[PDB]
Amino acid sequence: SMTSHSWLCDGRLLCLHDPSNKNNWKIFRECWKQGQPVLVSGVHKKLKSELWKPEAFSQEFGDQDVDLVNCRNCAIISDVKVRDFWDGFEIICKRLRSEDGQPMVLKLKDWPPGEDFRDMMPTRFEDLMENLPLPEYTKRDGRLNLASRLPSYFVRPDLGPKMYNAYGLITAEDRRVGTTNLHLDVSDAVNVMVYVGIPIGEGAHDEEVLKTIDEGDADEVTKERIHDHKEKPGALWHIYAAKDAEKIRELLRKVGEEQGQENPPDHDPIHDQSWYLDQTLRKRLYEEYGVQGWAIVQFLGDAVFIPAGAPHQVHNLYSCIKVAEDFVSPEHVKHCFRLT
Ligand SMILES: Nc1cccc(-c2cccnc2)c1
Numbered sequence: 161s162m163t164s165h166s167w168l169c170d171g172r173l174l175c176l177h178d179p180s181n182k183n184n185w186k187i188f189r190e191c192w193k194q195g196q197p198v199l200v201s202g203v204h205k206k207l208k209s210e211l212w213k214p215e216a217f218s219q220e221f222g223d224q225d226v227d228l229v230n231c232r233n234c235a236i237i238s239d240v241k242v243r244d245f246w247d248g249f250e251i252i253c254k255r256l257r258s259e260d261g262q263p264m265v266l267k268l269k270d271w272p273p274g275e276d277f278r279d280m281m282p283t284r285f286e287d288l289m290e291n292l293p294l295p296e297y298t299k300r301d302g303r304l305n306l307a308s309r310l311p312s313y314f315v316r317p318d319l320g321p322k323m324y325n326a327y328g329l330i331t332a333e334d335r336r337v338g339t340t341n342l343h344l345d346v347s348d349a350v351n352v353m354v355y356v357g358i359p360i361g362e363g364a365h366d367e368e369v370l371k372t373i374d375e376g377d378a379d380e381v382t383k384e385r386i387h388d389h390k391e392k393p394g395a396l397w398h399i400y401a402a403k404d405a406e407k408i409r410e411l412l413r414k415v416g417e418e419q420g421q422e423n424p425p426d427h428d429p430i431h432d433q434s435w436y437l438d439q440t441l442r443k444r445l446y447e448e449y450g451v452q453g454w455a456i457v458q459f460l461g462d463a464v465f466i467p468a469g470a471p472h473q474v475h476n477l478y479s480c481i482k483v484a485e486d487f488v489s490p491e492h493v494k495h496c497f498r499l500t
Pocket residue numbers: 162163164165178181182183184187
């Protein structure tokens with residue numbers, strides 16, 4: 161039967177089923193007030209699917225100059241064409257290769273650049289903004305979005321949206337690597353999975369993806385969305401409550417010291433955006449510091465709501481196109497205040 165919602169993370173994560181329901185706020189707001197992330201499924205069914213394909217981005221924008229990042233070593237690949245990224249998104253034999261001759265796992269950096277998304281892509285901007293869930297919170301002019309209503313005593317988000325475009329991590333060695341390392345944002349945000357590319361060439365890469373989700377500490381119900389309904393899994397997230405951010409800093413200061421980094425006692429390993437918490441580090445965080453997180457698998461069409469101040473990291477399982485919009489809810493406005 162079609163139902164309003166369900167739970168993931170053993171009851172700790174709300175999953176809303178109908179992205180456009182007028183009454184979603186009645187279920188959302190208590191979870192949000194408590195500082196929990198929220199998942200909303202089904203957003204892909206509301207979009208114009210032809211606007212969000214890798215072939216279209218290549219055809220329309222392919223001649224632009226860009227930098228890429230090698231996810232395995234964080235090396236910058238300088239001054240290449242946007243088509244060199246997009247043409248290898250799902251076809252492995254077209255990907256740029258490192259000097260060893262292996263195809264690289266790449267991220268498209270700062271594209272579209274800064275705040276140019278709306279100017280460069282006006283039809284995509286309208287398609288995203290009209291179909292965001294919880295529109296009183298997420299629209300630029302929503303009644304519960306304080307972004308346009310606050311004085312300079314508050315850090316205001318940049319004009320978005322932002323795209324997150326990167327290949328899937330492949331190997332057993334790739335399991336300990338981040339697509340995006342651990343960090344936090346002072347604004348709230350909604351991150352939408354608008355396309356998942358499951359490759360061909362090296363195709364039949366199914367079983368390493370299952371071992372990644374298991375070792376990622378995914379709950380038993382999350383494991384059923386694969387085996388039962390065959391949805392396409394895009395990325396593995398870990399998210400931590402904003403209240404746990406300092407205990408995480410204390411752990412990473414200690415591990416930095418153990419690995420022979422030489423760091424002042426006050427330096428900020430979350431702001432540095434240099435760490436990925438692998439299975440070893442997540443178990444140590446739980447055992448030594450008493451901190452538990454949310455392990456979330458974002459499928460095609462899932463929107464992840466990320467609370468202001470909540471540390472989070474992302475590990476792509478397959479090639480992903482994500483689009484995120486920042487907002488300032490009243491529940492979490494304390495996180496962007498510039499005093500005390
Ligand atoms: N049975 C059913 C099916 C679909 C949406 C809903 C719904 C969602 C959100 C709030 N109120 C109702 C209920």
